[PDB]
Amino acid sequence: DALMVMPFSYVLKFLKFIDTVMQNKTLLHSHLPLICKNLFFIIKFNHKELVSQKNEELKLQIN
Amino acid sequence: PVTLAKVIKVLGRTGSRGGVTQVRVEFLEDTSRTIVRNVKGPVRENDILVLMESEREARRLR
């Protein structure tokens, strides 16, 4: 319920946060299941708006 | 000019003030875009609100 309240503008912020965590392998494997549950829920909830965006930078982050 | 937005989700456990409901709405003009708003009356999903301003983002009203 906390993630659903988040606006989409903060979802892009959340995605950037997950991107920055990826470089730190220590943090990623420390909280890998938690990251997955929040990340997949964020994508599922507002998938429609995410796909509509034409930002080339965002496409690279998700890759 | 006033925009029309259809409510897609009635957010819960938002801690809003009594009688105020925080909802997530989708613009009729642009289906992709969504915005979070505060509503005063009884509200459910799929009903349309007239937004006089479309840039402000809802904040918890206590």
């Binding site: 319920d1 906390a2 993630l3 659903m4 309240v5 988040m6 606006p7 903060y10 | 456990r13 938002t14 801690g15 918890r60």
Partner: peptide
């Protein structure tokens, strides 16, 4: 005080 989600946005 702040609730979950509202705290996350601030963070």
């Amino acid at each position: 005080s702040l609730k979950a989600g509202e705290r996350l946005m601030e963070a």
